[PDB]
């Protein structure tokens, strides 16, 4: 299918910058997720790829062809809206046919296209039914089938599972990955759901504030976060953060809590003159021990079940962090504990810019 | 079916397309016919099919002389190199058509078409037209259509010609699984050295209407029987340097001389051969800066090939290619010595181009 390149795409309605210099290539047949919070520009980017919105500047290529000023009809794209719906007085068949009926396609052609997409989406037994007879899951499949009826080269999905209940969501997301695979259709998938992105996507573009902060495989974006926000948006619970000051070659958190600068950062910190850092560590990368030892010291705040374990929330002066603990242990409120983190699993970020500090790669 | 080709000759008047071919293709085996354009490899495939008849010689399927019989009556499934689907026919009809031409009943047509479609993983494509399929999908329809009359032998003339580099490297593996899945005797024409080595149980190397060698990938690669065999497998293939035998030395130039490789002294002197071809593979030799021990030459050109460098080196009148570390720096005219361990040198008779044999270890 189509490889898409976005080259220096900017979208400015006026003074608000919706998209700022978006550079991104989605590969032929790839499932790309656009992951970010509300108002990040993730949906705007999708609408810009579709053609519904026009960039202020920059180019959009589908394969060789510049499609930047082409309207959506000419770009051969399929779009499922976030808040998609089927017409209730139309059968499943007519719901899929209607875009072609409106284009005046001959009936023979329409009937053949619907036959084909219905089978692809596993709805060929429901053609005669009305939406009130279908499940949310079945309805979603019809929505997708209708998006393919004009045989597009890209599938664009703006948080489509947002309609469905959270449990069904879990099944349907794996079924959607299977479909994208068998079609080999280039797919761009907008979501605010980190777990969904990590489970479905080939690559994830983490979007923040009109900007692609990072693009990588699940493993890359999770294990090698380039900015604090990237670390903070993935995992449940996500990466913990504690602010520190570089004082006398240590990372000072509290009057009573400080750590050495990991040896791998000593030259970087020294020659950049960085004094204010953010220490990052994931909840599963640390251990709580009771008492004040050497580590990040704080006080037990709360605890809650998570799976077979508990997630223990610890307050560290201003900040709150979460660390997994055995279900059997009892942590009482205000109890003094030390958080042990192996330095190899510690990410350091500049406070001001939130950029990860990276030493010379081995 | 086990296929025996017996003294096959094919002449188009004054041109000898096939010159005394003797080949046994075993029951259930994947046989590659490997050679360059114009080698006779396709003419041979068409002679196995029955579209061409031998000028003289016989073809047996199991024990039956099928020489005079057409393809249909031999139960061959043939896929042409420039195969094509009818564009106004659905995938279903395209597959059905040979059965419809044979006046087959409805139930037979539908059962065979749907069954072959499943086996070729094209059953979801049955109502689409050829223009709607990818090249890969269209190639599977072609194979399916060849299998729909229950062939005893599958004959494939470089069909994958249409597919892109990357897609082809995996679709060959696929074809090989299907062939093993069905256990159908399969003969596969290709000019592609790498493909034949990856796919075939045995490879017949064809040049100028003759089979030079039939063997496993290891046999034809590691134990080539003719210069051309060594010259046609590998990328790059085997290097050849001509030499004169003088007093236990092989003389390439006044500058380049080497002892007759110790394994070959007996057969070279026994026969009184005065010239030979020295063959060695690009990966079986090391380029060393300066003149010294071995075949000396001068750098001609170099380019990347994988995580390595392939260096073209001029050995006076001729050219050889040898691999080197990607970080090393060579330049035109640079004097080098190509170190070749005698264990990995082969010698061929200059006249017959046949490998010389020494007493076997």
UniProtKB/TrEMBL annotation, chain A:
UniProt-annotated location(s): Cell membrane
Signal peptide per UniProt: none
Membrane topology, record value: Peripheral membrane protein
Single biological process term from Gene Ontology: carbohydrate transport
CDD domains per record: ABC_MalK_N
Superkingdom of the organism of origin: Archaea
Stretches assigned to the ABC transporter domain: 4-234
Keywords (A to Z) from UniProt: ATP-binding, Cell membrane, Membrane, Nucleotide-binding, Translocase, Transport
Any single GO CC term annotated in Swiss-Prot or TrEMBL for this entry: ATP-binding cassette (ABC) transporter complex, substrate-binding subunit-containing
GO terms, molecular function: ABC-type transporter activity; ATP binding; ATP hydrolysis activity
PANTHER family: MALTODEXTRIN IMPORT ATP-BINDING PROTEIN MSMX, TREHALOSE IMPORT ATP-BINDING PROTEIN SUGC
Protein name: 362aa long hypothetical maltose/maltodextrin transport ATP-binding protein
Organism: Pyrococcus horikoshii (strain ATCC 700860 / DSM 12428 / JCM 9974 / NBRC 100139 / OT-3)
TrEMBL record, chain B:
Subcellular location(s) per record: Cell membrane
Membrane topology of the entry: Peripheral membrane protein
GO terms of molecular function: ABC-type transporter activity; ATP binding; ATP hydrolysis activity
GO terms (BP aspect): carbohydrate transport
CDD domains per UniProt: ABC_MalK_N
SMART domains with a match to the protein in the record: AAA (SM00382)
Start and end residues of each ABC transporter domain: 3-233
Cell membrane keyword on record: yes
UniProtKB keywords: ATP-binding, Cell membrane, Membrane, Nucleotide-binding, Translocase, Transport
Protein name: 362aa long hypothetical maltose/maltodextrin transport ATP-binding protein
Organism: Pyrococcus horikoshii (strain ATCC 700860 / DSM 12428 / JCM 9974 / NBRC 100139 / OT-3)
């Amino acid at each position: 299918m189509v490889e898409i390149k976005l080259e220096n795409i900017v979208k400015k309605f006026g003074n608000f910058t919706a998209l700022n210099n978006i550079n991104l290539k989605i590969k032929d047949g790839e499932f790309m997720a656009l992951l970010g919070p509300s108002g990040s520009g993730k949906s705007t980017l999708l609408y810009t790829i579709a053609g519904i919105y026009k960039p202020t500047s920059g180019k959009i290529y589908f394969d060789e062809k510049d499609v930047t000023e082409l309207p959506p009809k000419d770009r051969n794209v399929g779009l499922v809206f976030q808040n998609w719906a089927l017409y209730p007085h139309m059968t499943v068949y007519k719901n899929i046919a209607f875009p072609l009926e409106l284009r005046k396609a001959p009936r023979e052609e329409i009937d053949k296209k619907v036959r084909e997409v219905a089978k692809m989406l596993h709805i060929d037994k429901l053609l005669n039914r009305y939406p009130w007879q279908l499940s949310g899951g079945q309805q979603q499949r019809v929505a997708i089938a209708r998006a393919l009826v004009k045989e597009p080269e890209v599938l664009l999905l703006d948080e489509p599972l947002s309609n469905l209940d959270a449990l069904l969501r879990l099944e349907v997301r794996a079924e959607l990955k299977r479909l994208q695979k068998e079609l080999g259709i280039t797919t761009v998938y907008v979501t605010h759901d980190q777990a969904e992105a990590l489970a479905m996507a080939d690559r994830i573009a983490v979007i923040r504030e009109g900007e692609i902060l990072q693009v990588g495989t699940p493993d890359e974006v999770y294990y090698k976060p380039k900015y604090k926000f990237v670390g903070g948006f993935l995992g449940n619970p996500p990466m913990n953060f504690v602010e520190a000051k570089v004082e006398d070659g240590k990372l000072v958190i509290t009057e009573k809590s400080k750590l050495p600068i990991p040896k791998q950062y000593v030259e970087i910190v020294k020659e950049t003159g960085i004094t204010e850092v953010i220490i990052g560590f994931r909840p599963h990368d640390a251990e709580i021990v009771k008492g004040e030892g050497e580590g990040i010291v704080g006080e037990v705040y709360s605890f809650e079940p998570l799976g077979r374990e508990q997630i223990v929330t610890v307050s560290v002066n201003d900040s709150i962090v979460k660390v997994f603990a055995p279900e059997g242990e009892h942590f009482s409120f205000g109890e003094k504990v030390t958080i042990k983190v192996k330095e190899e699993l510690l990410v350091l970020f500049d406070k001001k810019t939130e950029k990860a500090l990276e030493f010379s790669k081995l």
